[PDB]
Amino acid sequence: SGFRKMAFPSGKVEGCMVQVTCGTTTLNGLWLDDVVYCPRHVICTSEDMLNPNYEDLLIRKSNHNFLVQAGNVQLRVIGHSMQNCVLKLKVDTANPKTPKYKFVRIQPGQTFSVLACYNGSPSGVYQCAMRPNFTIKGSFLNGSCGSVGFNIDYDCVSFCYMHHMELPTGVHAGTDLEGNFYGPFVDRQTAQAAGTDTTITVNVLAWLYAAVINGDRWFLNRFTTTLNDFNLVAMKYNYEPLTQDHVDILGPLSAQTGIAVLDMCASLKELLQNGMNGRTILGSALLEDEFTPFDVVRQCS
Amino acid sequence: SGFRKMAFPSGKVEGCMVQVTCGTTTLNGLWLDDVVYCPRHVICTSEDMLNPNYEDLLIRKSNHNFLVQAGNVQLRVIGHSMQNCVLKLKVDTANPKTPKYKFVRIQPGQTFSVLACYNGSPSGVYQCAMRPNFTIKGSFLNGSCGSVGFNIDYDCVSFCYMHHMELPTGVHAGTDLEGNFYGPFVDRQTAQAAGTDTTITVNVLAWLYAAVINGDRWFLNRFTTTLNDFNLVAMKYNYEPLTQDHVDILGPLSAQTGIAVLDMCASLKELLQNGMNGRTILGSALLEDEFTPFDVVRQCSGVTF
Numbered sequence: 085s086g087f088r089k090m091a092f093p094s095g096k097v098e099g100c101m102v103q104v105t106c107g108t109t110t111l112n113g114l115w116l117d118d119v120v121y122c123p124r125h126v127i128c129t130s131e132d133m134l135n136p137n138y139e140d141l142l143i144r145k146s147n148h149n150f151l152v153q154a155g156n157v158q159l160r161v162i163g164h165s166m167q168n169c170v171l172k173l174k175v176d177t178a179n180p181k182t183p184k185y186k187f188v189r190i191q192p193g194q195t196f197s198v199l200a201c202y203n204g205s206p207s208g209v210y211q212c213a214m215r216p217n218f219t220i221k222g223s224f225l226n227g228s229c230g231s232v233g234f235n236i237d238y239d240c241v242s243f244c245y246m247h248h249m250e251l252p253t254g255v256h257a258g259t260d261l262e263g264n265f266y267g268p269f270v271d272r273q274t275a276q277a278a279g280t281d282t283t284i285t286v287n288v289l290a291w292l293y294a295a296v297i298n299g300d301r302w303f304l305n306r307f308t309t310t311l312n313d314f315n316l317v318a319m320k321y322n323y324e325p326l327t328q329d330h331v332d333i334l335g336p337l338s339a340q341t342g343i344a345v346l347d348m349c350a351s352l353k354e355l356l357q358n359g360m361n362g363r364t365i366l367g368s369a370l371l372e373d374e375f376t377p378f379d380v381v382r383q384c385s
Numbered sequence: 386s387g388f389r390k391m392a393f394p395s396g397k398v399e400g401c402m403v404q405v406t407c408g409t410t411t412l413n414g415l416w417l418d419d420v421v422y423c424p425r426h427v428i429c430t431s432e433d434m435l436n437p438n439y440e441d442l443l444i445r446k447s448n449h450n451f452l453v454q455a456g457n458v459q460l461r462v463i464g465h466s467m468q469n470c471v472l473k474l475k476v477d478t479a480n481p482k483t484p485k486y487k488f489v490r491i492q493p494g495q496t497f498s499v500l501a502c503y504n505g506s507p508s509g510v511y512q513c514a515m516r517p518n519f520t521i522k523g524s525f526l527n528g529s530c531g532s533v534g535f536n537i538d539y540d541c542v543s544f545c546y547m548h549h550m551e552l553p554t555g556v557h558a559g560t561d562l563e564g565n566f567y568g569p570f571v572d573r574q575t576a577q578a579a580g581t582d583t584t585i586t587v588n589v590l591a592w593l594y595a596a597v598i599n600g601d602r603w604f605l606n607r608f609t610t611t612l613n614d615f616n617l618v619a620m621k622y623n624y625e626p627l628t629q630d631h632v633d634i635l636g637p638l639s640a641q642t643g644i645a646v647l648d649m650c651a652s653l654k655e656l657l658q659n660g661m662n663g664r665t666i667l668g669s670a671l672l673e674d675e676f677t678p679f680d681v682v683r684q685c686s687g688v689t690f
């Protein structure tokens with residue numbers, strides 16, 4: 085028993101992390117096979133940060149303008165291209181530590197592990213979720229760009245996030261590993277703001293199911309709700325709409341606990357109305373929304 | 386910016402995890418140099434559960450009674466011995482992925498990363514604190530015994546915890562890597578309970594400093610307190626006493642934020658007496674106590690390993 089913010093073991097990703105330098109900019113890259121992936125803004129100058137033309141900046145680079153260090157060894161760059169907002173540097177050595185891997189673009193509400201890195205070296209690992217407004221609430225300092233987010237469900241690393249920017253509210257934006265930003269953000273320092281964030285309702289319900297699996301029932305009640313009525317109430321607390329897809333996804337947890345999904349929805353409605361009245365759920369005094377239904381099954385069974 | 390419950394990168398420890406089987410019991414072992422460490426109760430039967438005589442149970446075992454698998458490779462056990470509550474299996478091959486390491490016993494209030502493993506395979510990593518009552522609030526399922534906890538200093542892994550058991554409240558107990566239990570627990574299935582827990586005051590203060598560094602300031606006030614006066618409040622609310630050592634350790638954070646410890650203590654006292662009045666701090670509605678002062682410095686300054 086127990087329930088923790090549990091990341092994937094980071095070793096398979098640690099072996100891929102390198103340092104990339106161009107000009108006076110140093111950040112992290114991801115060395116997979118003979119390709120190093122990193123944010124294209126490594127080629128930005130101090131005067132290129134508002135309206136860089138990355139095509140024009142890149143055509144002026146030679147392979148030797150990119151310094152790539154893997155531990156104490158310099159990797160020789162033998163080619164480069166850009167794919168959306170990511171730079172792909174061909175190197176003359178395939179990484180002998182490359183794990184089985186794929187690139188996946190995730191949807192809001194999905195969770196993943198982040199390996200925060202500086203100068204190509206890992207500093208720590210933590211769990212994150214893609215927020216409904218397409219930001220992530222990470223923990224990142226200067227030099228952390230190029231750090232990646234990933235899952236490792238079945239010995240295969242699924243890379244889903246690479247870190248590019250910090251908005252003034254202290255939250256973070258980045259791309260998938262094909263270089264497409266999550267959300268409407270651009271890799272320019274022009275003023276940008278995330279939409280109002282909302283709570284990931286299906287994840288809160290998954291976590292309430294985890295609480296019952298771990299033996300806690302105090303928040304249940306004798307009521308049910310229609311899906312329509314639940315959504316009318318929940319949206320008044322800035323919760324995301326719950327879809328029939330979400331209801332279907334919660335079927336397994338509902339089956340394991342004997343609590344119908346719409347009965348859990350009635351419990352959540354009352355929790356929003358009442359608060360926790362000095363109690364806690366799974367060690368929290370708030371409704372946690374960064375555990376997916378899949379995460380709960382992974383950790384509780 | 387931002388602040389997360391952050392574990393150490395686990396790669397150095399993943400390469401040490403193996404599966405150990407004796408009879409019908411399978412659990413995890415830690416393979417370092419030419420020794421595999423695991424809980425001594427791996428030699429227990431379903432009828433040795435309650436009142437085992439480990440000295441007696443171990444004499445009947447031969448090296449081949451212990452099946453050690455590292456991935457798909459079976460390691461040949463060439464000797465065995467027991468140190469306190471841990472079994473040491475000497476194998477004929479040194480682990481080529483052995484990192485720089487040492488065994489360290491931690492103190493209550495100190496934090497560490499847990500690598501949860503099943504069948505010798507690492508499955509997840511998370512950060513824990515050793516509670517004042519010497520339990521840890523882990524997340525563990527069947528087959529997780531022998532999972533380990535660790536810190537990293539400067540490329541040196543400090544192993545501090547091995548998982549042994551789950552108590553009826555769902556919290557967990559284990560040993561250091563020399564087989565000494567943390568807390569008043571024994572490795573047999575007799576009735577046992579965790580004592581009343583308390584809150585790690587110095588860690589709460591560290592986390593309040595992290596909040597201030599991240600722009601959360603609503604709880605600051607003009608007041609200061611004395612160590613004596615605060616500890617009277619601390620005792621009243623089941624908080625651990627604050628010592629001068631704790632004040633000294635928070636010194637860096639006091640200087641960096643401009644809030645003296647006893648200044649922050651007045652903030653904490655008010656939070657205890659009044660609560661948080663509907664507000665949150667760093668995304669929590671509770672006073673968080675599983676970040677040490679060093680954890681806050683490490684995360685907010687970007688230390689790497």
Ligand SMILES: *[C@H]([C@H](C[C@H]1CCCO1)NC(=O)[C@H](CC(C)C)NC(=O)[C@H](Cc1ccc(F)cc1)NC(=O)OCc1ccccc1)[C@@H]1CCOC1=O
Nearest residue numbers: 111125224225226227228229248249250271273274275276
């Ligand atoms: C990674 C770094 C992100 C790190 C820094 C702290 C945690 O994450 N990336 C950058 O700094 C980005 C570089 C550009 C893409 C060229 N820029 C940003 O993240 C900026 C930071 C910023 C914020 C506010 C400012 F007024 C000026 C700069 N974010 C940004 O521009 O948001 C848009 C915006 C909103 C509102 C007003 C103005 C702008 C790095 C970079 C180099 O090496 C690394 O590791």
Ligand SMILES: *[C@H]([C@H](C[C@H]1CCCO1)NC(=O)[C@H](CC(C)C)NC(=O)[C@H](Cc1ccc(F)cc1)NC(=O)OCc1ccccc1)[C@@H]1CCOC1=O
Nearest residue numbers: 412426525526527528529530549550551572574575576577
């Ligand atoms: C590891 C496993 C611990 C795992 C199990 C879930 C998460 O952690 N270890 C064991 O099961 C221990 C084996 C003994 C040391 C011989 N036993 C316990 O942990 C017991 C389980 C238990 C819990 C609650 C109970 F009510 C009864 C039994 N804990 C315990 O003994 O608590 C004391 C007690 C209190 C009240 C009544 C009776 C006893 C393992 C085991 C084998 O392989 C693994 O991975």
Ligand SMILES: [Cl-]
Nearest residue numbers: 189190191194
């Ligand atoms: Cl997804």
